[PDB]
Design an enzyme around this catalytic site. Structure first.
Site, short mmCIF file in Angstrom:
data_model
loop_
_atom_site.label_atom_id
_atom_site.label_comp_id
_atom_site.label_asym_id
_atom_site.label_seq_id
_atom_site.Cartn_x
_atom_site.Cartn_y
_atom_site.Cartn_z
N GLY D 144 0.78 -1.30 0.66
CA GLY D 144 -0.09 -0.42 -0.27
C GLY D 144 0.50 1.28 -0.18
O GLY D 144 0.14 2.41 -0.76
N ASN D 206 9.70 -10.73 -8.32
CA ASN D 206 10.14 -11.40 -6.97
C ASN D 206 9.91 -12.55 -7.41
O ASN D 206 10.98 -13.96 -7.01
CB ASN D 206 9.04 -11.24 -6.23
CG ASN D 206 9.74 -10.05 -5.22
OD1 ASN D 206 11.22 -9.65 -4.77
ND2 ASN D 206 8.56 -9.63 -4.24
N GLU D 254 21.03 10.12 -19.73
CA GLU D 254 21.38 8.67 -21.02
C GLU D 254 20.91 7.78 -20.28
O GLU D 254 20.92 6.74 -21.66
CB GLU D 254 23.00 8.70 -20.13
CG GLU D 254 24.12 8.24 -21.40
CD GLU D 254 25.44 8.42 -21.36
OE1 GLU D 254 26.18 9.23 -20.56
OE2 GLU D 254 26.26 8.08 -22.05
N1 LIG Z 1 12.72 -8.43 -2.90
C1 LIG Z 1 11.87 -7.80 -2.30
N2 LIG Z 1 10.43 -7.85 -2.18
C2 LIG Z 1 9.62 -6.97 -1.04
C3 LIG Z 1 10.46 -7.24 0.14
N3 LIG Z 1 9.54 -6.53 1.32
C4 LIG Z 1 7.83 -6.81 0.30
N4 LIG Z 1 8.07 -7.49 -0.61
C5 LIG Z 1 7.05 -7.64 -1.37
O1 LIG Z 1 6.74 -6.61 -1.44
C6 LIG Z 1 4.44 -6.96 -1.92
C7 LIG Z 1 4.25 -5.75 0.11
O2 LIG Z 1 4.74 -4.50 -0.33
P1 LIG Z 1 5.70 -3.95 0.80
O3 LIG Z 1 6.92 -3.39 0.04
O4 LIG Z 1 5.47 -4.97 2.48
O5 LIG Z 1 4.18 -2.98 1.59
P2 LIG Z 1 4.30 -1.03 2.29
O6 LIG Z 1 5.57 -0.77 0.71
O7 LIG Z 1 5.23 -1.42 3.30
O8 LIG Z 1 2.96 -0.58 1.81
P3 LIG Z 1 2.59 -0.91 3.55
O9 LIG Z 1 0.51 -2.16 2.93
O10 LIG Z 1 1.13 0.00 3.89
O11 LIG Z 1 2.76 -2.02 4.09
C8 LIG Z 1 5.22 -7.75 -1.89
O12 LIG Z 1 5.07 -8.71 -2.62
C9 LIG Z 1 6.86 -8.44 -0.85
O13 LIG Z 1 6.01 -9.67 -1.78
C10 LIG Z 1 11.60 -7.02 0.03
O14 LIG Z 1 12.40 -6.82 0.95
N5 LIG Z 1 12.79 -7.34 -0.35
#
Ligand SMILES: Nc1nc2c(ncn2[C@@H]2O[C@H](COP(=O)(O)OP(=O)(O)OP(=O)(O)O)[C@@H](O)[C@H]2O)c(=O)[nH]1
Ligand SMILES: Nc1ncnc2c1ncn2[C@@H]1O[C@H](COP(=O)(O)OP(=O)(O)CP(=O)(O)O)[C@@H](O)[C@H]1O
Ligand SMILES: Nc1nc2c(ncn2[C@@H]2O[C@H](COP(=O)(O)OP(=O)(O)O)[C@@H](O)[C@H]2O)c(=O)[nH]1
Ligand SMILES: CC(=O)N[C@@H]1CNc2ccccc2C1
Ligand SMILES: [Ca+2]
Ligand SMILES: [Ca+2]
Ligand SMILES: [Ca+2]
Ligand SMILES: [Mg+2]
Ligand SMILES: [Mg+2]
Ligand SMILES: [Mg+2]
EC number: 3.6.5.-
Lengths: 348, 53, 425, 438
Positions: D144, D206, D254
């Site tokens: 979110g 991912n 670039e």
């Molecule tokens: N590659 C990678 N993907 C991540 C990581 N943390 C979360 N994700 C991916 O990000 C998505 C979830 O979104 P988040 O970034 O955790 O949520 P947010 O941006 O903190 O927003 P909120 O809903 O407020 O928590 C899922 O697809 C997760 O698999 C990470 O550390 N590395």
């Protein structure tokens, strides 16, 4: 418990394969839009390859090779043969062909006329055929004007004026070979072929009546008056054809024809392997192919076209469809001979 | 197969090989944010109105 | 610091809530006096979600005990962990509610509700960032059902943007105290449809069948039934009480479980459920097979009679996380006909390293299934069998209610059943 | 010298940012306390690494970075982590409660109340720049915050820094490491509102990183730490030209000039090789041709798709380690004769090659093995449209039933923004098809 979906209801071949899968009690059919499948019997046009292989924990397999249309399209094949170094423009088993776009739309119009004018001056046979609704003529003016009246791409290739005519009857024919390529890109040739013969005597002084020139099963069963006279359904199988070649020509089907057919199948499929192989792909593919050949009076085999969604002869549906399950489906999804195919070994 | 624009330095080099020739303003963003804040307020008022009945 | 405020109301609500705090207090190493004596930092990582920290390193449950009779709460105060609850958080009257929804919701309960809200407000004012509320109660009685939903209505009025969660015990004629339970349950369900974000439906007949048929308890008691609820409540809250990414808080859990606002009634499940052959190790495949088995579900609704909109699974204990994914993907890929195909990847799995007391590993199941309509169909049919003759209504009209309010609750529940039916096709 | 500011939004952005700046420090010899013994200009300098690091009078090298999260648990890791000393508190911004995987909650409800604070903290970093190039924005599609607040930040950045380039590093949702069912909604909502504000976006799926970790690193169940250390290697390879002496992709502009000939089609495919397990006894070091050839294998692409059935608009080869131009050209020739590399007729068929002699740095105790040479290929292929197709399909399935929509309308978003965003994706898929297919 393996799972599959059916997305081509018109496919007679895979209607049986789906019938066999369920008969094993180890395969379960899902709705055509359920993504959790192991095997997709996909549609013909616009198959969504990009959505395959993205389901965690499911080995997904589909009955079509993405990119094989380059071989199963009239215009595409001509381009593939002329542009692929593996086949070269001097490829001896493919009729001299040219891609001709209608004037209402590169294009090989002028290149075709040059070769056409060459034959006309050299007293040689200068009969060509246009297809993509077919026209056989010996005047270049009629071939081009016929394509301009349409609105799709066409191809003009040399018409084999000296075909091999079966006796009695003096009748043309063509040979259908079913070929199965599995996920490992093994080229399997079905041991059983079919000759779609013309029930009308071949006539070289009248290309207007196209009943004795086109061996299509639908044309012989609609516009021919001798349908089913010599063989049931204008379909002679290899056993009969081989015996004929021995009694009349003192040779075998294997030596006189089958070696060239196996050579042509290998050349075509090996050529596009780097482009369509799913070896290192997130999903797997296999595909049944229908090769159509021509045999001239010199016992030289010519490639006519390749069909990507072929139909099978009524007598051979059970054997081939079961063979598809054995080498194509169970090889990736095993179940809890004397193979009916002929492996065409090659270098990957 | 041509190599053009070869630039070399102590930490590496770069070049190019050719195989074949050939918005909303700040005012409008505030409005959208306040428009959504207004639709939330209206929905919560209907909820409180419902709870008052 | 995502604090949750717990509320338990009525006999059933207070007896189940008491056992709940008994179970998780043990998991977090909190003793009956509020002193911590665990041995793993994972116990305190998210401890403040359910406990307040007092002077002397004392952990005080963030719970409010509500009832219109003193009796049950005297028992809690004398219970095993009775001394751990904040004394000011016992709010009780003397009249009782006589298993009468109207008395809990309109008369007896109205006189007491404001004082309960004073304690709720106090607990919230000391929350760094309040997630929301969870309520334990039954629907067949008068206090938990009638005053319970009155509390929810007033909490949603004062905290409109917080998540409201309940564990609601649904009455069953096979495990019944009075004949008016369908009346009280039908009136409550409409309240829950409007004012809760998540409701865990617990059916007393299912708890009974499990004790009798699976656990081999010849004569089940309310106590035995509450053992199942305790274990289930501990499982479904593991995501909140321990470090994890999936269903981390109440709002994210609701966002992934509730595709439509009114269809927020879940079927919980638990595995293993073993009789006393109790020391046998349980494999991951077995844990997964049983966890989805209807006999391990506590809403008394056959999942094969509907389709799962969403599913949340929590595996507890040191186990092959890889082997968990395989069995979970195996269950879905072996029964994909009971999952709606228009919500991709609607089955989520979470893992927790700390297992429940006395178990190497377990699995807790949370399902949002259209089969839950069978539970509201049962209640609706029992309601109508009596209401068509206006049987036992005088208990309610005597408290100022009108027949019209019953006709509307009847239609409200039949609408809910119809809403589930359109998504099952 | 021209500075670049990195912005990290949401859990994914922050945890990936932590892994990148850890790598940056090891690559430039910067210690956790910010000191850099090799920097002979104390308290200042206009070196290449200064595009990412400022300097204090005490000699501390401070990242030009801002971390933003609507909840504090992830950024608190940074505040107490190994490199806590690098950042000062102004750089780490955390709210009280997250967006609950709800785009509307991050963009409207919570975003509106913290946006001006974030811009003010970015403005502070900008005021330290004598010639700011632009921004590198790290975020997820599915979260979110990563989806909702990022798109709001981008809109404002285009307003406050009109002439500044903005690049993205976006995490594409994959169910194997996801627990939010609505991430297709969030992904499509944030792509629609960010498209006109992003000059170039590197999508990392991912699913792809997960399988590379299981296949090449022999990790049965990869964690975010495993995924992020691999992602930061690819990010490092992409940003190296900005942090080291060189002549290719020397400034953010670039990247667009060399990778994005059409503005809407600004999603280059990244391919990286080799990824070798450190637990291996000892791997045979791969050659220039072998690592280059691997750039056309789907197995090492940041997004699973088949470039054989698309068309290339540009192609960048970024080498690190023992590589000379002679070997690169030799491998490229051998690949054209075996591979299916079709370019669009209005783009030259060629490759821009950059070589940094310093081999990839590996984090001590990490999963990756030290390799003598590595390459990252950036190619703008129409084949990456398969990821939009997959994503748009899942969107259609849920939206046909309006599943979960009430959560978004409840936060102030109108339902018509769903269809508006979906129609923009349908047009985006059409753009790719007009460029790639015949
Ligand atoms: N590659 C990678 N993907 C991540 C990581 N943390 C979360 N994700 C991916 O990000 C998505 C979830 O979104 P988040 O970034 O955790 O949520 P947010 O941006 O903190 O927003 P909120 O809903 O407020 O928590 C899922 O697809 C997760 O698999 C990470 O550390 N590395
Ligand atoms: N160059 C040529 N010389 C001689 N005959 C030819 C020819 N080209 C086509 N034919 C005739 O046309 C028939 C096949 O036509 P073609 O295969 O091109 O149409 P089609 O694809 O609709 C039939 P199918 O796909 O089922 O094999 C054969 O029977 C053959 O006799
Ligand atoms: N599972 C369980 N159910 C109970 C218990 N006590 C009562 N019930 C059920 O709750 C309903 C009666 O509600 P009750 O809580 O006793 O009335 P209240 O005190 O006015 O809220 C009936 O359906 C009972 O079967 C209990 O200890 N455990
Ligand atoms: C459902 C209901 O209200 N039942 C009543 C509860 N209180 C009460 C008191 C005195 C005598 C009878 C009763 C029955
Ligand atoms: Ca009174
Ligand atoms: Ca310096
Ligand atoms: Ca701009
Ligand atoms: Mg055809
Ligand atoms: Mg009672
Ligand atoms: Mg977050």
């Amino acid at each position: 418990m393996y799972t599959f979906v059916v997305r081509d209801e018109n496919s007679s071949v895979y209607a049986e394969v789906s019938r066999l899968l369920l008969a094993t009690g180890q395969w379960k059919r899902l709705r055509k839009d359920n993504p959790r499948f192991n095997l997709m019997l996909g549609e013909r046009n616009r198959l969504p390859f990009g959505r395959l292989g993205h389901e965690p924990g499911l080995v997904q397999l589909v009955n079509y090779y993405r990119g094989a249309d380059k071989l199963c399209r009239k215009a595409s094949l001509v381009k593939l043969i002329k542009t692929s170094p593996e086949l070269s423009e001097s490829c001896t088993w493919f009729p001299e062909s040219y891609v001709i776009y209608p004037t209402n739309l590169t294009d090989e119009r002028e290149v075709f006329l040059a070769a056409y004018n060459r034959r006309r001056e050299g007293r040689e046979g200068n009969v060509w055929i246009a297809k993509s609704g077919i026209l056989i003529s010996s005047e270049a003016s009629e071939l081009l004007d016929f394509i301009d009246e349409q609105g799709q791409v066409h191809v003009i290739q040399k018409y084999l004026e000296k075909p091999l005519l079966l006796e009695p009857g003096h009748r043309k024919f063509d040979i259908r070979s079913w070929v199965l390529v599995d996920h490992l890109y093994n080229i399997y040739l079905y041991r059983e072929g079919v000759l779609r013969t013309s029930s009308e005597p071949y006539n070289s002084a009248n290309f207007q009546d196209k009943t004795c020139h086109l061996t299509n099963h639908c044309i012989q069963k609609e516009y021919s008056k001798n349908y089913g006279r010599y063989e049931e359904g204008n379909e002679m199988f290899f056993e009969e054809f081989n015996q004929y070649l021995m009694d009349a020509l003192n040779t075998t089907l294997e030596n006189s024809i089958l070696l060239q057919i196996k050579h042509i199948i290998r050349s075509c499929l090996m050529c596009i392997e780097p482009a369509i192989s799913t070896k290192h792909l997130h999903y797997q593919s296999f595909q049944l192919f229908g090769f159509d050949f021509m045999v001239d009076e010199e016992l030289k085999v010519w490639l006519i076209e390749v069909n990507g969604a072929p139909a099978c002869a009524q007598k051979l549906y059970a054997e081939l469809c079961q063979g598809i399950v054995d080498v194509a489906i169970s090889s990736v999804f095993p179940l809890a001979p004397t193979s009916i195919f002929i492996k065409l070994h090659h270098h990957h | 197969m041509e190599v053009i624009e070869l630039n070399k330095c102590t930490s590496g080099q770069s070049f190019e090989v050719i195989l074949k020739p050939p918005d909303p303003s700040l005012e409008e963003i505030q409005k959208k944010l306040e428009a959504a804040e207004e639709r939330r307020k209206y929905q919560e008022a209907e909820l409180l109105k419902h709870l008052a009945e | 610091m995502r604090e949750i405020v717990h509320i338990q109301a009525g006999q059933c609500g207070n007896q189940i809530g008491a056992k709940f705090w008994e179970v998780i207090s043990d998991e977090h190493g909190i003793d009956p006096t509020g002193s911590y004596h665990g041995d793993s930092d994972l116990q305190l990582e998210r401890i403040n979600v359910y406990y307040n920290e007092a002077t002397g390193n004392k952990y005080v449950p963030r719970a409010i005990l509500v009832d219109l009779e003193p009796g049950t709460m005297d028992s809690v105060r004398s219970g095993p962990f009775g001394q751990i609850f904040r004394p000011d958080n016992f709010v009780f009257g003397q009249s009782g509610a006589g298993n009468n929804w109207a008395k809990g919701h309109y008369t007896e309960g109205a006189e007491l509700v404001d004082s309960v809200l004073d304690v709720v407000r106090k607990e919230s004012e000391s929350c760094d960032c309040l997630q929301g509320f969870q309520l334990t109660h039954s629907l067949g009685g008068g206090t938990g059902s009638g005053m319970g939903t009155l509390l929810i209505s007033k909490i949603r009025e004062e905290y409109p943007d917080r998540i409201m969660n309940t564990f609601s015990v649904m009455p069953s004629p096979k495990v019944s105290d009075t004949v008016v339970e369908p009346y009280n349950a039908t009136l409550s369900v409409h309240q829950l449809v409007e004012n809760t974000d998540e409701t865990y439906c617990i059916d007393n007949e299912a708890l009974y069948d499990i004790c009798f048929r699976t656990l081999k308890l010849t004569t089940p008691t309310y106590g035995d039934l509450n053992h199942l609820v305790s274990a289930t409540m501990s499982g479904v809250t593991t995501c909140l009480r321990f470090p994890g990414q999936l269903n981390a808080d109440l709002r994210k859990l609701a966002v992934n479980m509730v595709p439509f606002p009114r269809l927020h009634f879940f079927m919980p499940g638990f595995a293993p459920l073993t009789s006393r052959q109790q020391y046998r190790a349980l494999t991951v495949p077995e844990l997964t097979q049983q966890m989805f088995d209807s006999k391990n579900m506590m809403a008394a609704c056959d999942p094969r009679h509907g389709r799962y909109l969403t599913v949340a699974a929590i595996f507890r204990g040191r186990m092959s996380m890889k082997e968990v994914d395989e069995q979970m993907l195996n269950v879905q890929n072996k029964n994909s006909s009971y999952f709606v195909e228009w919500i991709p990847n609607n089955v989520k799995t979470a893992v927790c390293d700390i297992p429940p007391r006395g178990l190497k590993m377990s699995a807790t199941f949370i399902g949002n299934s259209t089969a839950i309509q069978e539970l509201f169909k049962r209640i609706s049919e029992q309601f109508t069998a009596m209401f068509r003759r206006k049987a036992f209504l005088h208990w309610y009209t005597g408290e100022g209610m009108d027949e019209m309010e019953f006709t509307e609750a009847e239609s409200n529940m039949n609408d809910l059943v119809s809403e589930y039916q359109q998504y099952q096709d | 010298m021209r500075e670049c500011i990195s912005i990290h939004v949401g859990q994914a952005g922050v945890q990936i940012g932590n892994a990148c700046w850890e790598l940056y420090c090891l690559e430039h010899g910067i210690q956790p306390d910010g000191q850099m013994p090799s920097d002979k200009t104390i308290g200042g300098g206009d070196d290449s690494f200064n595009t990412f690091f400022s300097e204090t009078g005490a000699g501390k090298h401070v990242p030009r970075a801002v971390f933003v999260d609507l909840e504090p648990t992830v950024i608190d890791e940074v505040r107490t982590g190994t490199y806590r000393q690098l950042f000062h508190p102004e750089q780490l911004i955390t709210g009280k409660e997250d967006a609950a995987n709800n785009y509307a909650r991050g963009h409207y409800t919570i975003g509106k109340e913290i946006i001006d604070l974030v811009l003010d903290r970015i403005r502070k970093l900008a005021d330290q720049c004598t010639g700011l190039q632009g921004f590198l924005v790290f975020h997820s599609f599915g979260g979110g915050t990563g989806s909702g607040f990022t798109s709001l930040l981008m809109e404002r950045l285009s307003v406050d820094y009109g002439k500044k380039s903005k690049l993205e590093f976006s995490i594409y949702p994959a169910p194997q490491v996801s627990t939010a069912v609505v991430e297709p909604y969030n992904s499509i909502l944030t792509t629609h509102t960010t498209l006109e504000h992003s000059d170039c976006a590197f999508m990392v799926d991912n699913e792809a990183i997960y399988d590379i970790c299981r296949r090449n690193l022999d990790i049965e169940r990869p964690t975010y730490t495993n995924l992020n250390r691999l992602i930061s290697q690819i990010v490092s390879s992409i940003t190296a030209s900005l942090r080291f002496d060189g002549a290719l992709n020397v400034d953010l502009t670039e990247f667009q000039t060399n990778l994005v000939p059409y503005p809407r089609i600004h999603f280059p495919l990244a391919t990286y090789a080799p990824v070798i397990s450190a637990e291996k006894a000892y791997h045979e070091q791969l050659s220039v041709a072998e690592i280059t050839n691997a750039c056309f294998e789907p197995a090492n692409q940041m997004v699973k798709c088949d470039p054989r059935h698309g068309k290339y608009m540009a192609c960048c080869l970024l080498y690190r380690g023992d590589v000379v131009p002679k070997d690169v050209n030799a491998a490229i020739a051998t690949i054209k004769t075996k591979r299916s590399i079709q370019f669009v007729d209005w783009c030259p068929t060629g490759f821009k090659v950059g070589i940094n002699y310093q081999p990839p740095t590996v984090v001590p105790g990490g999963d990756l093995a030290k390799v003598q040479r590595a390459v990252c290929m950036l190619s703008n292929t129409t084949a990456i449209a398969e990821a939009w197709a997959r994503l748009d399909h899942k969107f259609d399935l849920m939206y046909a039933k309006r599943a979960f929509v009430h959560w978004y309308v409840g936060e102030g978003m109108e339902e018509g923004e769903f269809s508006e965003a979906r129609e923009d994706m349908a047009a985006l898929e059409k753009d790719y098809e007009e460029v790639g297919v015949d």
